[PDB]
Amino acid sequence: ATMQCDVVSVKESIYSGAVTMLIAKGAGGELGILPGHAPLVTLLQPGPIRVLLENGTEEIVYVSGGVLEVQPHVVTVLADTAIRADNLDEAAILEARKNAEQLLANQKSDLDSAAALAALAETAAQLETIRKIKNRAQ
Amino acid sequence: ANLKEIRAKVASIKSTQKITRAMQMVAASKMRRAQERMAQGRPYADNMRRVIAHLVQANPEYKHRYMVDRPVKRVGYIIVSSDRGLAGGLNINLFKKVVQHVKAQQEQSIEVQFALIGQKAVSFFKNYGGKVLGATTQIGDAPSLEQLTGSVQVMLDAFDKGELDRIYLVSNGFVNAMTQKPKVEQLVPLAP
Amino acid sequence: LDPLVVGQEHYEIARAVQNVLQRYKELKDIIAILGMDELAEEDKLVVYRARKIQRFFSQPFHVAEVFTGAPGKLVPLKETIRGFKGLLAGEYDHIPEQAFYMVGGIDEVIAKAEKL
Amino acid sequence: LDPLVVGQEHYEIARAVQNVLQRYKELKDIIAILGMDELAEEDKLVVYRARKIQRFFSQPFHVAEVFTGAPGKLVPLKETIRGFKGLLAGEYDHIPEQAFYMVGGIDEVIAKAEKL
Amino acid sequence: VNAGISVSRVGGSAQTKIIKKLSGGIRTALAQYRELAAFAQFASDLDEATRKQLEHGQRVTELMKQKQYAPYS
Amino acid sequence: VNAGISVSRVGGSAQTKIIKKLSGGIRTALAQYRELAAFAQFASDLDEATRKQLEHGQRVTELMKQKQYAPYS
């Protein structure tokens, strides 16, 4: 039948929704999971986990470290790095993510500094020079 | 007369005014971004603590050093800060509070050890002295788990040595969109 | 104001005092613009030093009690010199700034502070 | 100073040079604050171009306080514009500014680069 | 020219019917562009709508310039 | 002396060879110091060649004081 299965990395969820058949490689062996299965907790081994959908097609999700839990109706996948993928080759996209983050950090460091710190010095240029020449009565 | 440079200063200040406005609304967008980023990771630890509690009630046979406090001789502190200033004394208030707390602990004749996050605290506490165990730079406004993995791992190892026996976060609590409070709380000796 | 006349210590203490005040006045602009917290620690220290200096200058005068009532003072120069040097030594950075307002000698400052 | 009186090419080359220079000056703030590294190679070629243009400005005067033998350069405007547009393009953005320093024509710049 | 301060006290009543009809959109686009001048440095923490306003204002700015001795129909 | 503005249009032509030779380095050191002084309010954000220039220039700023009645050879 259908079980509500959820795949989630510590950052955020990756997969959610009903699933029919789950095939993984637990801390021990590989197992097949169907709704109504016994309550169990298993340690995810590195590699992709592939599950069968209600449409008759099968999803696959990669895991590099994580834990797996099964209940007769609900499955939660607390994976360390949970990535929607088919092969352990997402190295080409994780680096892209890191470059995006560091680039936006570069934008932060520039626009904070370039705008303010420059303007910080600029706005404080010659204030007292003007303040003293007030009391000039001439 | 010499009014010219006065006019120039006025214009420059006006430009800086619009600069600050742009900066502030940009920061507001980023704050809403982080603030929605808050809860997204909640259910992870929620259900995880849930099954942890199920385990411990099912198996009360022991409490590990990671749930119950052993007598402390050195206490560890994970201190988060920024690399960009211009955020009031928020980081400074955190530094003041953590310095106050660590001074309060030093009367207990116990050493203190550190975990450094952000250039603000980096400078502040490489000036503040003590025995730092780790330092981290350039979180980026989006971090990676691996970035803090080894940092926290060193802290765990120091706990395993029995040298660190209580481990503290040093962060700032989101009171609301305008109000922020510093916070320093132990986490490794697990509270009920 | 001559070192061969005023004595070396007098001269140098005075010069250092003016120097401190000069930096404080200079930084007044930015501290008005920016947050006092966003500054270097030594800068802020010097700021508090100078403010306490200003207060330590504030003195009651023997005829001034007419509009106040507080008894005026006459402070021997030795007390002045020693107190200002002790401030410039930072012997009192833990002392509230109020303890220096409208006072005479440094011992009066001690009495005010311990009172406070 | 007009694309007619000096010709369109000369006018636009002057435009390009001034744009490179004002881009450099607007860069100076980030250059000082952040340094030279955190800025990506974008506009860094512009910084090189501006510096090598400023040094390219050097004409050894035939009377100059005497440092380079006091020669009269007076290089033809055609050579000048050719060299300046080549520099703006980045053709020799791989060649140090000193090659452009105290020298006139592109022959001089290239021979200097071979020397240095 | 700075449109922010220059003005004719008569208004489009002295324009051409079609010109009077159409110039208002350009005018308000310029107004918007002036409103958002400061944000040109970022263009990356905005919403799409403000970015689009910025782009169209840049475009009309580009349009505004004309060369010398260039009468136009 | 405000060295930032004070000049001698005559130049070192009336200065001894040795002092005139040594002049240029100090001249450019002070030039750099006054040039980068705009951001001297915080030496915590700059690169390290800037710190080196800072320290050298402030040291050259030092050595400039002089007591009165002291005929320095």
| Distance in angstroms (rounded) separating the CA atoms of residues B162 and B173 | 29
The CA distance from B114 to B123, in Å, is 13
Report, as residue numbers or ranges, the catalytic residues of E: 9
Q: Provide the token pair at E55.
A: 């782009």
Distance CA B170, CA B115 (A): 9
- C30 interfacial to chain F (CB closer than 8 Å): yes
User: Is the CB of C37 inside 8 Å of chain B's CB atoms?
Assistant: yes
The breaks in chain B (C to N more than 2.5 Å) occur after none
- Rounded CA-CA distance A121/E7 in Å is 36
Q: For the sheet with B180-186, list strands across it.
A: B131-136, B111-117, B74-80, B164-174, B180-186
* Residue C51, phi then psi, degrees to nearest 5: -65, -45
Which residues does chain C have within 8 Å of residue B89's beta carbon, measured at their own beta carbons?
A: 35, 37-38
What is the phi-psi region of residue C90: left when phi exceeds 0, alpha when psi lies from -120 to 50, beta otherwise?
left
Domain-wise residue ranges, chain C: 1-116
- C-alpha distance from F46 to closest chain A C-alpha (Å): 11
Q: Which helix (H) or strand (E) holds D31?
A: helix D8-34
Q: Which residues of C touch A118 (CB under 8 A)?
A: none
Q: How many Cβ pairs within 8 Å bridge chains C and F?
A: 3
Q: Which residues of A touch D30 (CB under 8 A)?
A: 110, 113-114, 118
What is d(CA A30, CA A57) in angstroms, rounded to the nearest whole number?
Answer: 20
| SS3 category, D15 | helix
**Resolution of the structure, angstroms:** 4.6
* Residues whose CB falls within 8 Å of the CB of residue B28, separated by 6 or more in sequence, listed in order: none
H/E stretch holding A76: strand A74-83
Beta carbons of A73 and A60 less than 8 angstroms apart:
no
Please indicate whether, in this complex, the C-beta atoms of D30 and A106 are within 8 angstroms of each other.
Answer: no
- Which residues, 6 or more positions from D50, have their beta carbon under 8 angstroms from its beta carbon? D20, D21, D23, D24
**Structural domain containing residue B126:** 60-192
Q: How far is B155 from chain E (nearest CA, A)?
A: 36
Q: Does the CB of A127 have a partner CB in chain C at under 8 Å? A: yes
Query: For chain D, which chains pass the contact test of at least 3 CB pairs under 8 Å?
Result: A, F
Residue F69 falls in which region: left (phi positive, over 0), alpha (psi -120 to 50) or beta: left
Query: CB-based contacts of D104: which residues, under 8 Å, 6+ apart?
Result: D59, D60, D73, D75
Structure tokens, B184: 């320093």
Does residue D15 contact residue D56 with C-beta atoms inside 8 Å? no
Contacting E with CB below 8 Å, chain A residues are 107, 111, 114-115
In a mutational test of the A interface, the residue from F2, F35, F39, F46 whose CB has the highest number of chain A CBs within 10 Å is: F39
- Residues of F in Cβ contact (< 8 Å) with A119: none
**Tokens at residue A124, please?**
């404080």
Topology classification of domain A3-83: ATP Synthase; domain 1 (2.60.15)
